[PDB]
Design a protein around this nucleic acid. Structure first.
Lengths: 66, 64
DNA sequence: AAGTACAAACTTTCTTGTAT
DNA sequence: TATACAAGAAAGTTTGTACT
């Protein structure tokens, strides 16, 4: 009953990644990862480019489990 | 194929729907979809939703 | 009518700059 | 070195309509 911001952290934290390694594995600016993480951004448009970076299912990041 | 556009049309039609029909099930605006196929929307926000009306795969729909 | 396009307005996301 | 906040610019979505 998670947020997307919660999945980004746990994931990015578990791949032991800074917000700038992730921000950049995925070609983003770190400030963009932050926002998603902040609860600020809710439908990142780079949701696929970043899942690649986190190596996770885009649909899981975006939406949760069941 | 190519572009998101090429992939979006083909399949709409082939699914046999119209912008307004899709868009109404993707449940966005006929217009949002016009811009996509039109090649102006490079990265939909309703993509899991569009693609899910068309009934496929977002990755597949987005890219391939 | 039926189906698709075209355009400003309004919104959400991503960046250019620091601050902490 | 890592993360966070603030305006504004870019990408998308709606609102409204014109054309075939």
């Amino acid at each position: 009953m998670q947020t997307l911001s919660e999945r980004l952290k746990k994931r990015r934290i578990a791949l032991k990644m800074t917000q700038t390694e992730l921000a950049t594995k995925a070609g983003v600016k770190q400030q963009s990862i932050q926002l998603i993480e902040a609860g600020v951004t809710k439908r990142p448009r780079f949701l696929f480019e970043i899942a690649m970076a986190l190596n996770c299912d885009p649909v899981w990041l975006q939406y949760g489990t069941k």
